[PDB]
Paper text:
We found a strong and direct interaction between Tat:NLS/CPP and importin-α, and no direct interaction with importin-β. The final model consisted of 426 residues of importin-α, 8 residues of the Tat:NLS/CPP, and 319 water molecules. The overall structure of importin-α exhibited an all α-helical structure arranged as ten sequential armadillo (ARM) motifs. There are no NLS residues in the minor binding site, indicating that the NLS region is monopartite. Tat residue Lys50 binds importin-α at the P2 site where it forms a salt bridge with importin-α residue Asp192 as well as additional side chain interactions with importin-α residues Gly150 and Thr155. The side-chain of Tat residue Arg52 in the P4 position hydrogen bonds with the importin-α main chain of residues Leu104, Arg106, and Glu107. Here, we show that the C-terminal 55RRR is not providing additional binding to importin-α, and of the residues visible in the crystal structure 48GRKKRRQR, only residues 48GRKKRR mediate binding with importin-α. The overall binding buries 717 Å2 of surface area, and is mediated by 15 hydrogen bonds and 1 salt bridge interaction.
Tat is a transcriptional trans-activator and plays an important role during HIV-1 replication by binding to a short-stem loop structure, known as the transactivation response element (TAR) located at the 5′ end of HIV RNAs. The classical nuclear import pathway is the best characterised mechanism and is mediated by an adaptor molecule, importin-α, also known as the classical nuclear import receptor, binding cargo that can display a nuclear localisation signal (NLS).
Residue numbers in the entry:
A (entry chain B): 48 to 55
B (entry chain A): 72 to 497
Amino acid sequence: GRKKRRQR
Amino acid sequence: GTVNWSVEDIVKGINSNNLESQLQATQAARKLLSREKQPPIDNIIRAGLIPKFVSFLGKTDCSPIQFESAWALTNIASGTSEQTKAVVDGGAIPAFISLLASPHAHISEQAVWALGNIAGDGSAFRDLVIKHGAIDPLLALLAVPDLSTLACGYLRNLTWTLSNLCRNKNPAPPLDAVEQILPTLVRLLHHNDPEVLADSCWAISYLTDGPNERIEMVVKKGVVPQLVKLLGATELPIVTPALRAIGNIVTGTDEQTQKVIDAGALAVFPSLLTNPKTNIQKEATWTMSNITAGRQDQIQQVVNHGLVPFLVGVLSKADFKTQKEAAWAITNYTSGGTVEQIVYLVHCGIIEPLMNLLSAKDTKIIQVILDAISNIFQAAEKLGETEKLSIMIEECGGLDKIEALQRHENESVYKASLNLIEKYFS
């Protein structure tokens, strides 16, 4: 993909 | 607790001389950076906290602050290139690679994630992660006899990060890094989890997006049969990258294209060329256009699999972008096909939908269509049947459309149209 932010 | 801290409180805690106070504050920062809307990434950067977080990555004695700081930095690195750059500039890359060996899986996983964000920013940071030596320890995490023994989320993060190390061009990833990753990639491509499969296909789609020598590295690993199998999956997140990879492979040599045909790919295309998702239809027609650009025996396989009627279908009705790919597919087919193959094309009904597309306000598709008409006449001359074709074009309104294109401003359009009128419509 590209980028991912962790939210939980 | 640590819910909803102000940035200045976080700063106060991280600047204390108390590791537990620092842990508290780092967790508070992680919770700000994980919130649903508008994480204060820039406020955290401006507060000067990245170097503190990076130094916390090295505190083997306090694994919780390694985890919290790893999570905080991952989410800073998930943003803009400038935000990712701030993390890299703080020394994060070697610190995260060292954490891949952590005995705590949740920390190692977070380091995998962080490196995926960094590499996912673009070519330069991708190659910098590689130069710091990330591939060896990443692949070592997957050196198990059965991938099923790994935690599902853990394996998905590893696959996703590996796919980012395969991503981007100008330049493409180092050849030696690709060779190093590919055997593990071929193995992930056979894993049963839908998300692992999707990201493995994305990785292959990146690696086949290039010159024929790059395609060859992939095809030589024998993955084309597995890609065709995934082409028939019910999960759209799998079909999309699998189709992109197949499409990339058939932009290569005719020998590379033949591997796709031999693997049974053409039997999937009746459903792909009618797929409800317009992007699947478009990329399936694009793929077809680069198969009809091949040998006559490859054109013949398209015929045998009953796919010419489906090309007539998309040309007749589809999203315009798909219709343009279908026009290309027809021009390539008429350019390289035998006379019998071109005759069959006309008997399938290609002329009328081809003519109808001449009223499109796209000068490139008009050029493509006019080339195709010229090619079809050339096959008709060889049979002495120009007039029959001339009449067929007249009956469906094609002559009106070609006549007007003599008035088109584009030079190629009005030359080709006038040429057609003169030679066949007199």
